[PDB]
Amino acid sequence: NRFTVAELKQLVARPDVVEMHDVTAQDPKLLVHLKATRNSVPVPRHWCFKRKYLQGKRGIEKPPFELPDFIKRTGIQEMREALQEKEEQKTMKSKMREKVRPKMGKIDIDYQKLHDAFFKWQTKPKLTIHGDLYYEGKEFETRLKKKPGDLSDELISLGMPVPPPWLIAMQRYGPPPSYPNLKIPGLNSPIGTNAAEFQTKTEEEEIDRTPWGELE
């Protein structure tokens, strides 16, 4: 009575989204239609996991919260650290005795500095665009994966004047099979004629970049 995954995948306009269990849906056509619509964010992945959300062994070793920089500029952390480091040395006698004879003007930061922290030095944090749902491993798997033809400064280790050393051999051994469309200079890319870079120069000359309606 129900579709297998192959018929469903051909019946979608877009077959990359279909999963094992979508055929078990009561209306699978509409489900895979909705999964392939623009700007919708997928169901959180742990719906099928037996372990509870965020209850995982890696989460045991999470470090303490760190303040932002504009707050550490106030010096609140050093003051309050010193304060609570004295207050573990006091006995119950001494604590209950300074509760009848208090000590004024102890931990005071001037108001202008605190105002400046909030009304001058505030910086917007790193934010995430819509659809970027958090999942449990996320902050460790945030390294990602940098493409051939784009190099890092450090990869300094080569120390070669600017083409790649390996290419002097890629033309020898051939274009790698894994990449069908890759283009590198000297093999199938201009160091024919080389007018590709001139196009970008001419266009970059053409543009005005003056944002409309900004503050003066």
Partner: protein, 539 residues
């Protein structure tokens, strides 16, 4: 007390009746020559006429002061006039002439002149050299001229086939003509489309040329452009749908008609007609060639002698294309419901590549480019947005991943605003000489507004505080919330409603004084600041 100066500025100053102490002087700059003031009488009231390079009449309407310039040539001198032929008029001498003038309509912002058309105008373009207009008109349910004539002849045959005197009646039936603008237009049915191209002089209003199309061919787009390969020769491209049904939608096809503009823009000469497989809803000139969006396909067309010629068509736009804008080698495509798409055209690969888009569904009706990175748009639902492109984005994309079933780079929405009525036209322009630019929009209902950017924070804080006071002090008259009204579909962003703010002057004087206390200003100063921004952008 009204004063005029060599500079050209008019000073209207309070004068205390019992004491004689001038108070506040709100200067205005009008014209370029010395201004001369003459007292006249309008509506049984004592208005003032100040004449500079252009005349300017200051009067009070609905117990509210106005200053609007006469749309008429400069005058040396003037004075009041009353007689049987004209009860309230102006006698004015320009050099070597004398004339009598009557201002029939007062209190208005625009005067208009109207030039009749036959069907509903969809678009027009301006020929740059001639300054003419090329207008396409289209109607559903309609007969063209020729189909109407054949239909009428068939009916006159039918009057004879019914029954010897009858042909006399049918003669009168062929003869009499009811004027269609006052008796209606005959309605034809579903799928019946009358359409017309018209070339028109904007000053005089006469039809320079007229092209009538076939009975189910409906014009939807127009362009005037010079194809760079063929040389300096203007061509007009008109996109036409063939046999279009609306509910449910179906179309038999499309054509693009090419005309040349001869005789300095007087005439269209038919060149060829090239068939496309879906309705060409947007045509845009693009670096010596043209971009045509046929349905969901974006294609570049080069002029060939037998037809237009196709190069590098794109096929990844989600739905129907409804409008195309260009700057440089960037193309901004307005999907019918998928909002804006940014596409880059790279020459030496000959391909069109989607590099960015938007994160919201938007039913776009129009668009206009504010700068190289910003697009303003409007919906059918009645709201304007301003979408910017984030500073890191590069259009160097070479053709899998994508974010959220779309492009890998997303554009940021930086303004939302619900106008209230469907906007069909945005244009960035300057309205007055020596003004600043603004974004002008015209709604379907007949309204015209502007969206003007603040130049300082101090202005922006003042106007935001005036708005927040008035939302509570002077709430909308039908029980609606203002912040909720302007956030009808998307939350309001970065706009101060000035229609609400200029209702300051309609509040009660205790309320005006109470509000103006917290702005630390007197109610004349608040009215002056509300009136300064309107003055230096607009009318």
């Amino acid at each position: 007390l009204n004063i005029g100066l060599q500079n050209g500025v008019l000073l209207r100053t309070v004068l205390d009746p019992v004491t004689g102490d001038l108070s506040d002087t709100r200067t205005r700059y009008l014209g370029s020559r010395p201004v001369k003031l003459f007292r006249v009488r309008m509506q049984g009231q004592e208005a003032v006429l100040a004449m500079s390079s252009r005349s300017w009449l200051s009067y009070s309407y609905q117990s509210r002061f106005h200053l609007t310039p006469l749309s008429y040539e400069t005058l040396e001198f003037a004075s009041g006039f009353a007689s049987e032929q004209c009860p309230e008029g102006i006698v004015a001498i320009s050099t070597n002439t004398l004339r009598i003038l009557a201002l029939e309509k007062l209190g208005a912002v625009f005067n208009q002149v109207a030039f009749p058309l036959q069907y509903t105008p969809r678009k027009f373009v301006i020929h740059p050299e001639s300054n003419n207009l090329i207008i396409i008109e289209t109607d559903h349910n309609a007969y063209t001229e020729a189909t109407k004539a054949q239909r009428k002849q068939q009916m006159a045959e039918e009057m004879v086939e019914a029954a010897e005197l009858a042909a006399e009646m049918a003669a009168a039936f062929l003869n009499e003509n009811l004027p269609e603008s006052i008796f209606g237009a005959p309605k034809a049915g579903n799928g019946q489309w009358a359409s017309v191209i018209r070339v028109m002089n904007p000053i005089q209003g006469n039809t320079l040329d007229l092209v009538q199309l076939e009975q189910n061919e409906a014009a939807f787009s127009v362009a005037v452009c010079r194809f760079s390969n063929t040389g300096e020769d203007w061509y007009v491209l008109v996109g036409v749908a063939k046999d279009l049904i609306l509910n449910p939608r179906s179309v038999a096809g499309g054509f693009v008609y090419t005309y040349k503009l001869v005789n300095n823009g007087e005439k269209l000469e038919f060149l060829h007609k090239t068939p496309v497989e879906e309705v060409p809803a947007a045509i845009a000139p693009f670096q010596g060639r043209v971009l045509i969006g046929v349905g969901k396909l974006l294609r570049v067309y080069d002029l060939g002698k037998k037809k237009l010629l196709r190069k590098c068509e794109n096929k990844h736009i989600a739905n129907y294309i409804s409008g195309i804008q260009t700057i440089g080698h960037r193309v901004i495509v307005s999907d019918v419901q998928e909002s804006f798409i940014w596409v880059r055209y790279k020459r030496n690969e000959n391909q069109l590549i989607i590099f960015a888009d938007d994160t919201y569904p938007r039913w776009v009706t129009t668009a206009s480019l504010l700068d190289y990175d910003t697009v303003a748009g409007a919906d059918k639902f009645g709201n304007i947005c301003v979408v910017r492109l984030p500073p890191n984005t590069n259009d160097e994309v070479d053709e899998d991943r994508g974010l959220l079933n779309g492009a890998s780079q997303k554009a940021e929405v930086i303004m939302n605003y619900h106008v209230g009525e469907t906007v069909l036209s945005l244009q960035k322009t300057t309205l007055i000489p020596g003004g600043s630019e603004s974004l002008v929009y015209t709604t379907l209902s007949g309204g015209i507004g502007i969206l003007v950017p603040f130049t300082s924070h101090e202005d922006h804080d003042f106007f935001q505080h005036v708005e927040m006071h008035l939302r509570s002090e002077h709430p909308p008259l039908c029980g609606r919330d203002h912040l909720s009204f302007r956030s009808y579909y998307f939350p309001v962003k970065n706009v101060i409603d000035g229609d609400l703010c200029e209702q300051f002057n309609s509040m009660e004087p205790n309320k005006q004084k109470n509000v103006s206390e917290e702005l630390d200003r007197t109610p004349p100063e608040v009215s002056k600041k509300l009136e300064d921004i309107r003055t230096r952008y607009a009318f």
